């Protein structure tokens, strides 16, 4: 499906991403690289304002353009937030502004650190002929020390990658539908569910690598989309495609409704690469797997469909426990409306659960 920029092995994630910019952008790299210390000390802001307005042109191809969105990305948040206690003032200088606001409008992304940046493009396997495991993976850019931004980015990543096993049968699904192949479609739906259960195991690792109290107080403030004030020019899991992909594959209508829950999810598409946005919709353009599976009156097909929905609902429900442990509890011990959030996340679990057909 490579015109949508999906990869057999590594899903929506950018495969084997650039980790060296050109030389002309050695200025940029050596802020971003040594960024735990520039924030800690305070000589980050210093060093950004004491810089020049580099052109984006020398960035040739995609992989290189995207690394640039990352480097500029971590720099922007770190600059604007600072140490993340009071200093959060003062809009970016036009040194970093125009590149980011140029390169963002080029790659059709927002001028802001997104999932596509800080997870998808933000990794490398250390020993190039070793497997996609936690040992043999590391991120390109952290923010502080003990922000657990390695564990976080990489567990996030490894889920995209488990999902990649399911995503890659989806043509087999739509193929076997139009060509009236019950047996083919049936296996294809058990494959998906059997992979989406695999996706939950990877998810368990979050406990192991990401520290609860660390994440809340330290790291999340730099991924907080539009907290603060941009003040530049004319005006992060859950920006993931993985969940909305299979929302749509299984004809589960989240974004259909007159509700906040729904519109939030459809807005999240604007934080995705354009190619993924494109992909998602293509799925919607296709005949409904849900409606098809219903018409046939085939007990074993509903079973294999209900298995994919089970699998999703499973993921969503676990996701909540993770939020309890990594937001709610930590959020308490931190000297009104509060958590409508858990409403939101349930409202979406709920809606997925409703799409079961016994
Ligand atoms: C410490 C780890 C995580 C925490 C604390 C967390 C927290 C949250 C929260 C609070 C939301 C609601 C909107 C918001 O972000 O403000 C959210 C939404 C979401 N998160 Fe996460 N998340 C985590 C990891 C993940 C991972 C690894 C994935 C996928 C690989 C994921 C997938 C989603 C999705 C798809 C949504 C949109 C709502 C939905 O589809 O149900 N999250 N997350
Ligand atoms: C930052 C917020 C926001 O403000 N939105 C917003 C949307 C539109 C507009 Cl116009 C303004 C703001 C919104 C919620 C806080 C952030 C957040 C919270 C809790 N857990 C997280 C876990 C991982 C992660 F990556 C981010 C997490 C994410 C983005």
Swiss-Prot record:
Q: What is its main location?
A: cytoplasm
Its EC number(s): 1.13.11.52
What is this protein's tissue specificity according to the annotation? Expressed in mature dendritic cells located in lymphoid organs (including lymph nodes, spleen, tonsils, Peyers's patches, the gut lamina propria, and the thymic medulla), in some epithelial cells of the female genital tract, as well as in endothelial cells of term placenta and in lung parenchyma. Weakly or not expressed in most normal tissues, but mostly inducible in most tissues. Expressed in more than 50% of tumors, either by tumoral, stromal, or endothelial cells (expression in tumor is associated with a worse clinical outcome). Not overexpressed in tumor-draining lymph nodes.
The UniProt record lists the keyword Nucleotide-binding: no
Coiled-coil segments on the chain, per record: none
A Gene Ontology molecular function term for this protein is: electron transfer activity
How activity is controlled: the entry says: Activity is inhibited by and MTH-trp (methylthiohydantoin-DL-tryptophan), modestly inhibited by L-1MT (1-methyl-L-tryptophan) but not D-1MT (1-methyl-D-tryptophan).
The pathway it acts in is: Amino-acid degradation; L-tryptophan degradation via kynurenine pathway; L-kynurenine from L-tryptophan: step 1/2
**For heme b, which residues are the binding ones?**
319
As to how many cofactors bind and how, the note says: Binds 1 heme group per subunit. In the active form, the heme iron is in its ferrous state Fe(+2). The catalytic cycle does not alter the oxidation state of the heme, but IDO1 is prone to autoxidation.
Which leading EC class covers this enzyme?
A: oxidoreductase
Give the catalytic activity: D-tryptophan + O2 = N-formyl-D-kynurenine; L-tryptophan + O2 = N-formyl-L-kynurenine
- Where is this protein found? Cytoplasm, Cytosol
Q: Which Gene3D superfamilies match?
A: 1.20.58.480
Indicate whether Acetylation appears among the record's keywords.
no
What cofactor does this protein call for? heme b
Going by the UniProt record, its keywords in alphabetical order are:
Cytoplasm, Dioxygenase, Heme, Immunity, Iron, Metal-binding, Oxidoreductase, Tryptophan catabolism
InterPro entries, A to Z: Indolamine_dOase, Trp/Indoleamine_2_3_dOase-like
Q: One of this protein's GO BP terms?
A: T cell proliferation
Describe what upregulates or represses it.
By IFNG/IFN-gamma in most cells. Exogenous inflammatory stimuli induce the expression of IDO1 in antigen-presenting cells such as dendritic cells, macrophages and B-cells.
Leader sequence segment: none
| Function in brief | Catalyzes the first and rate limiting step of the catabolism of the essential amino acid tryptophan along the kynurenine pathway. Involved in the peripheral immune tolerance, contributing to maintain homeostasis by preventing autoimmunity or immunopathology that would result from uncontrolled and overreacting immune responses. Tryptophan shortage inhibits T lymphocytes division and accumulation of tryptophan catabolites induces T-cell apoptosis and differentiation of regulatory T-cells. Acts as a suppressor of anti-tumor immunity.
Q: How does it assemble?
A: Monomer.
Q: Anything further noted?
A: IDO1 is the target for therapy in a range of clinical settings, including cancer, chronic infections, autoimmune and allergic syndromes, and transplantation. IDO1 and IDO2 are 2 distinct enzymes which catalyze the same reaction. IDO2 affinity for tryptophan is much lower than that of IDO1. 50% of Caucasians harbor polymorphisms which abolish IDO2 enzymatic activity. IDO2 is expressed in human tumors in an inactive form: tryptophan degradation is entirely provided by IDO1 in these cells. IDO2 may play a role as a negative regulator of IDO1 by competing for heme-binding with IDO1. Low efficiency IDO2 enzymes have been conserved throughout vertebrate evolution, whereas higher efficiency IDO1 enzymes are dispensable in many lower vertebrate lineages.
Q: Which PANTHER family match?
A: INDOLEAMINE 2,3-DIOXYGENASE (PTHR28657), INDOLEAMINE 2,3-DIOXYGENASE 1 (PTHR28657:SF2)
Q: What is this protein called?
A: Indoleamine 2,3-dioxygenase 1
Q: What organism does the UniProt record list as the source?
A: Homo sapiens (Human)
- Which gene does this sequence derive from? IDO1
